[PDB]
Amino acid sequence: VPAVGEDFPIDYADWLPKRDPNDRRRAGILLHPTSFPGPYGIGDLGPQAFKFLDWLHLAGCSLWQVLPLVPPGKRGNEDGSPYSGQDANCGNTLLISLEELVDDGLLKMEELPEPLPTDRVNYSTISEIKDPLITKAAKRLLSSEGELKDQLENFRRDPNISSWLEDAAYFAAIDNSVNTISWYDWPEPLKNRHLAALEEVYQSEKDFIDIFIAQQFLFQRQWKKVRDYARSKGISIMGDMPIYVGYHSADVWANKKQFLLNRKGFPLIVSGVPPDAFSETGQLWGSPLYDWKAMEKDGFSWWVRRIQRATDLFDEFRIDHFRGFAGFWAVPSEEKIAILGRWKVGPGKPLFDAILQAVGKINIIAEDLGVITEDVVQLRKSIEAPGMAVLQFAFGSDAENPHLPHNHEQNQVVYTGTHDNDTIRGWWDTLPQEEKSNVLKYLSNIEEEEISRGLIEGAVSSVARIAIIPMQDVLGLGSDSRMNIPATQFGNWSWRIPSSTSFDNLDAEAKKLRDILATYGRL
Amino acid sequence: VPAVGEDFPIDYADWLPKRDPNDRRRAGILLHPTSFPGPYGIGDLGPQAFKFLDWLHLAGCSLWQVLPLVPPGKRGNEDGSPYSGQDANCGNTLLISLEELVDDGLLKMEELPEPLPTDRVNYSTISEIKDPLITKAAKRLLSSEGELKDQLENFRRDPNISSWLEDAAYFAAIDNSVNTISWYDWPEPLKNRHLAALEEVYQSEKDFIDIFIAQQFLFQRQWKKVRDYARSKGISIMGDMPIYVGYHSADVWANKKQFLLNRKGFPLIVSGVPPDAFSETGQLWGSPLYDWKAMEKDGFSWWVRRIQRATDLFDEFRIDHFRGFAGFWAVPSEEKIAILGRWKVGPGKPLFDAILQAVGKINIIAEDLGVITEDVVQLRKSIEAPGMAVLQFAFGSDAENPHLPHNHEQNQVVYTGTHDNDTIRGWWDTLPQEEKSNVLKYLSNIEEEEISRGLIEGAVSSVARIAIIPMQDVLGLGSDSRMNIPATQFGNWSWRIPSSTSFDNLDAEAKKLRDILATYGRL
Ligand SMILES: [Ca+2]
Ligand SMILES: [Ca+2]
């Protein structure tokens, strides 16, 4: 601008204030694709994904949130959990659409199963039904010589893809052949990745490895079709990543010096959270911990690759236990409970500086629920990451509760509830009378019969730039539709949209949401 | 904090996030003291001020907003306007309580007038009634020899006070003696402040000057009693200052080189705003403009003194036309309309840097209504000043309207309406049907009979850290109680709380406000 007291240009009054597109107010729906209806025992990236995205577009939503898309752990009572994955980078092959593989010519219509029970995912039977079909398709792809063969070859050779996929395929092949609980007990030449032993693995487990890679290609191609369709409708996909990875994975076995292991590969210290005046002992998660000091020395190369793959799948994503980047709880690996542990200093902002330098800007959402310390808030604000507000947590303390709408901020994501909460109606059903009275008073004395509308409107009318509603609340469902209970081992991750509910019969729900998105400026 | 990967102290989880007391959520009432009830034709700093502050305390309010406390212009149809003051620094002597002067022994009970009509301030008669009484009191103070005489002497000699008061008293004395419309036409030795001519003024106008100074002391002492009482009840007082001062004042006459005048003292350019597709021509305010370039050279000493006096009266204050600090509209002084003018570059952040350096931190509120340019937003954000939201302006455009609550931010002041808007009920009465339908839909489909409660709750439930309600809305009043209409010359600044309404009969109103301040975290 010119010097103080001098004339501005004649057109000064045209310099109107800039709205940054990064600040655009948006609404989205939380729906894991396993929850899609259809006849094959589990939701998939096929016809229902496209009908869902058409419904989201009709509703005026510009975001879709999913849980992690990784292959869930099969190897406890973590049955179907997206947060106990077998690999940080692979896609769950159970999300692969049998109908899309028929369209591709990789499966015959006659090979599809007769319609399976539609109410709930049965994680104890679904792998035995779909796995053989996904393998048949991969084998037909590997023997084919067209366009899809050429795409498989470009995928397998892509240096971003091969940086995790080769290790993930060889890990799976060795796990399948050796079949110990963990790689800690593998024969020394496989445990310690002797170059000759790995060459021998590829000769004796060639078909296993080729099929695993072809399955990952089939996932990638289906997911890219879904994401391209979403982008065509003005919809971004928000994903989710746990901060930690599981010990028994390619992530650890192929990258041992990224973790705090002893010279035999056993974790020195593992993840958890301490007591916070909660049931004497805290939580023993038991993941290996990162050697953040070693990571800093190579520019956090392992974390940069993890983020590159996340941006390959997602427009934006949440990191669970974001607080772990400022300070993390470390339990000696011999301990059977979390009590005996220490807070260690996390990597802080330099991790995010290195990601920015290598990958450019990413919308990372900081999962920041529970007790967090001032350094966590200072880290989050330092990288301009939004945190979370969850309305189901807002009404049980005082007016200083951060989840109450008058305490929200613009750079924040507001939920009615997540996959870890009950539905609005289930939560209401078990809520104490005093808290119910508090909720109704807060939301301008609305009636108890309209609690669902009141919380949904409470999220949409927030200053928070992103509002996310679980599909279960749009459908008006109760506790039988909850996705996860945090303390349990069974019944979780299995909710599906009922077979009787179809996206083409939800025009009324789409209009009801669209009207409040219009009113509160999210359209 | 220790090095990455090392232990934190054992007490890490006790480092909970810091709530800055500057961010505390507060509620206040807009009530100019002229509006206080009582028997002497105008509200004053006496018994009703204390009853008001007791009511505000009972209501849980922690702020009181007033208009400028300066002596209003008597010398047009600006009748009683706080924004056309005779001086930037003096207090309005019409706010001086006759009852408090009786308590002081400066007036006799027998000298007080018989009760005057109570409904409205009559600016054409109130000066002729109160001025002679305030003069009698000042004369008794000047002839007294006690505690109050000693306080008058300490006041008159205080270097902050004397920096504006001596000039203001000599200006008033010369204006009274010479009695031209403006000082531009004063005899040259008074116009140009010849040291000998000023010495002669004090000899021939000694009583006038001494009385003017004693009246300003009586104002100061009454105002300080009110502010001390407010602070005793946890109440801050928010004041208000126009960016510009009037030509015919001590501000200009004693500080000519602070303004853009010609060598005879006539303004080169004057203030206004251009057309913005509004009635062809814009607004010709006609104040002199600051020589911001000359001001920068002495560290903005004139502006620093203006702020010092504002902090002497107020805990915090709004600056009207804050945009003028980034860019201001300048009209050649010969022009009779605003059309022909140019935008000039304002002083920007260095003015605020100099104020910070000289006076320390002040809560300045930026009046930022109407069309403002990006540089105004960037200046405001650069000094972390809150702007305004006014709910009565929120509902007539689209969902991107900045006055709508989903567009508010934490560092902001939200009003239902100011002294320039109608009351909520008056505004409702003249609102078009389409806009009414829009308002009711926005506020969760409340009924039209509860519009006042709906807007008040809309302000209190905002994320904006300060919410201000006009006393007229608490009392449920209509258009007959509006303080100012922006386009008019008559009927303004005259509203009083009716004689039949007393603060001790408003317990129900105080509880109703207190309950929503509790709910929305402003208590
Ligand atoms: Ca096994
Ligand atoms: Ca005169």
Three-state secondary structure of A132-182: HHHHHHHHHHHCCCCHHHHHHHHHHHCHHHHHHHHHHHHHHHHHHHHCCCC
Closest CA to A312 of A481, A166, A163: A163
B72: Cα within 13 Å, side-chain hemisphere? 20
Spatial contact of B174 and B201, defined as CB atoms under 8 Å apart: yes
User: How far is the C-alpha of A444 from the C-alpha of A427, rounded, in Å?
Assistant: 20
Instruction: Kindly determine whether residue A457 and residue B444, on different chains, have CB atoms separated by under 8 Å.
Output: yes
Whether B375 contacts chain A with CB within 8 A: yes
DSSP state letter for B9: P
Output the six-digit token pair for B231.
Answer: 């602070």
**What's the A155 CA to ligand 1 centre distance in angstroms?**
28
DSSP secondary structure letters along A415-484: ES--TTSPPHHHHHHTS-HHHHHHHHHHTTS--GGGHHHHHHHHHHTSS-SEEEEEHHHHTT--GGG-S-
User: How far is the C-alpha of B481 from the C-alpha of A90, rounded, in Å?
Assistant: 69
Distances (CA, A) of B176 to B69, B182, B314: 22, 11, 30
Output the six-digit token pair for A78.
Answer: 């973590």
Residue environment code for A246-263, b if the CB has 16+ CB neighbours within 10 A, otherwise e: bbbbbbbbbbeebbbbee
**What's the B181 CA to ligand 2 centre distance in angstroms?**
6
Residue with tokens 């209190």: B460
Instruction: Kindly determine whether residue B1 and residue A409, on different chains, have CB atoms separated by under 8 Å.
Output: no
Give the angle A469-A470-A475 at the CA atoms, nearest 5°: 105
Residue of A7, A297, A343, A445 for testing the chain B interface, max B β-carbons within 10 Å? A343
Q: Name, in order, each residue with C-beta under 8 angstroms of A71's C-beta and a sequence gap of 6 or more.
A: A85, A86, A87, A90, A91, A92, A93, A94
Residue of B276, B298, B345 for testing the chain A interface, max A β-carbons within 10 Å? B345
**What's the A159 CA to ligand 1 centre distance in angstroms?**
29
Q: How many residues does chain A have?
A: 523
Residue with tokens 């706010």: B95
Q: Name, in order, each residue with C-beta under 8 angstroms of A276's C-beta and a sequence gap of 6 or more.
A: A282, A370, A371, B13
Three-class DSSP category at A370: coil
Read off φ and ψ for residue A372, nearest 5 degrees. Answer: -125, 160
Output the six-digit token pair for B438.
Answer: 């829009």
- Calculate the CA B214 to chain-centre distance: 23
One-letter amino acid for residue B74 of the chain: K
Q: Name, in order, each residue with C-beta under 8 angstroms of A59's C-beta and a sequence gap of 6 or more.
A: A29, A509, A510, A513, A514, A517
Spatial contact of B346 and B326, defined as CB atoms under 8 Å apart: yes
Q: What is the 3-state secondary structure (H, E, C) of A75-123?
A: CCCCCCCCCCECCCCCCCHHHCCHHHHHHHCCCCHHHCCCCCCCCECCC
Whether A274 contacts chain B with CB within 8 A: yes
Using CA atoms in the order B364, B368, B369, B374, what is the torsion angle rounded to 10 degrees?
Answer: -170
Output the six-digit token pair for A63.
Answer: 């975001």
Read off φ and ψ for residue A380, nearest 5 degrees. Answer: -55, -50
Q: What is the CA radius of gyration of chain B?
A: 24
Whether B2 contacts chain A with CB within 8 A: yes
Whether A296 contacts chain B with CB within 8 A: yes
- Annotated active-site residue B320? The verdict is yes
Read off φ and ψ for residue A388, nearest 5 degrees. Answer: -120, 145
**What's the A433 CA to ligand 1 centre distance in angstroms?**
49
B305: Cα within 13 Å, side-chain hemisphere? 17
Instruction: Kindly determine whether residue B463 and residue A461, on different chains, have CB atoms separated by under 8 Å.
Output: no
User: How far is the C-alpha of A413 from the C-alpha of A318, rounded, in Å?
Assistant: 10
Q: In this structure, are strands B363-366 and B316-320 parallel, antiparallel, or unpaired? A: parallel
CB atoms within 10 A of CB B438: 18
Using CA atoms in the order A289, A293, A296, A298, what is the torsion angle rounded to 10 degrees?
Answer: -90
Spatial contact of B123 and B77, defined as CB atoms under 8 Å apart: no
Spatial contact of B236 and B208, defined as CB atoms under 8 Å apart: no
Whether A11 contacts chain B with CB within 8 A: no
CB atoms within 10 A of CB B269: 19
Spatial contact of B70 and B81, defined as CB atoms under 8 Å apart: no
User: How far is the C-alpha of A270 from the C-alpha of A255, rounded, in Å?
Assistant: 17
Give me the residues of A, 173-232, that contact B with CB < 8 A. Answer: none
Three-class DSSP category at B29: strand
Whether A508 contacts chain B with CB within 8 A: no
Q: What is the 3-state secondary structure (H, E, C) of A56-70?
A: HHHCCCCEEECCCCC
Instruction: Kindly determine whether residue A15 and residue B374, on different chains, have CB atoms separated by under 8 Å.
Output: yes
CA dihedral sign of residues A179, A183, A189, A195? positive
* Nearest residue of chain A to residue B463 (CA atoms): A406
Closest CA to A509 of A465, A481, A462, A470: A470
Q: Which ligand is nearest to the CA of A175?
A: 1
Distances (CA, A) of B504 to A498, B41, B233, B235: 62, 21, 17, 18
CA dihedral sign of residues A440, A445, A449, A455? negative
Closest CA to A74 of A246, A239, A191: A246
Output the six-digit token pair for B457.
Answer: 């709750």
DSSP state letter for A348: -
**What's the B223 CA to ligand 2 centre distance in angstroms?**
28
The method of structure determination was: X-ray
Distances (CA, A) of A378 to A363, A384, B81, B420: 18, 10, 47, 41
Spatial contact of A494 and A441, defined as CB atoms under 8 Å apart: no
Residues of A identified as active-site: 320, 367, 420
DSSP H or E stretch at residue A339: none
One-letter amino acid for residue A312 of the chain: D
Spatial contact of B422 and B392, defined as CB atoms under 8 Å apart: yes
B433: Cα within 13 Å, side-chain hemisphere? 0
> In chain B, which residues are last before a break of more than 2.5 Å from C to the next N?
none
Three-class DSSP category at A16: coil
Give the angle A380-A275-A417 at the CA atoms, nearest 5°: 55
- Annotated active-site residue B353? The verdict is no
Spatial contact of B139 and B107, defined as CB atoms under 8 Å apart: no
One-letter amino acid for residue A334 of the chain: E
Residue with tokens 């990789």: A106
Q: In this structure, are strands A466-470 and B26-30 parallel, antiparallel, or unpaired? A: unpaired
Q: What is the 3-state secondary structure (H, E, C) of A472-485?
A: HHHCCCCHHHCCCC
Closest CA to A426 of A458, A470, A385, A382: A470
Three-class DSSP category at B111: helix
Whether A278 contacts chain B with CB within 8 A: no
Output the six-digit token pair for A16.
Answer: 């109107």
Q: What is the resolution of this structure in A?
A: 2.0
Q: What share of chain B is helix, strand, coil (3-state, %, to 5)?
A: 45, 10, 45
User: How far is the C-alpha of B126 from the C-alpha of B34, rounded, in Å?
Assistant: 11
Q: Name, in order, each residue with C-beta under 8 angstroms of A153's C-beta and a sequence gap of 6 or more.
A: none
**What's the B182 CA to ligand 2 centre distance in angstroms?**
9
Output the six-digit token pair for B291.
Answer: 């020589």
User: How far is the C-alpha of A64 from the C-alpha of B254, rounded, in Å?
Assistant: 66
Spatial contact of A327 and A346, defined as CB atoms under 8 Å apart: yes
Residue with tokens 């996340």: A310
Spatial contact of A174 and A186, defined as CB atoms under 8 Å apart: yes
Residues of A in contact with B15 (CB under 8 A): 373-375
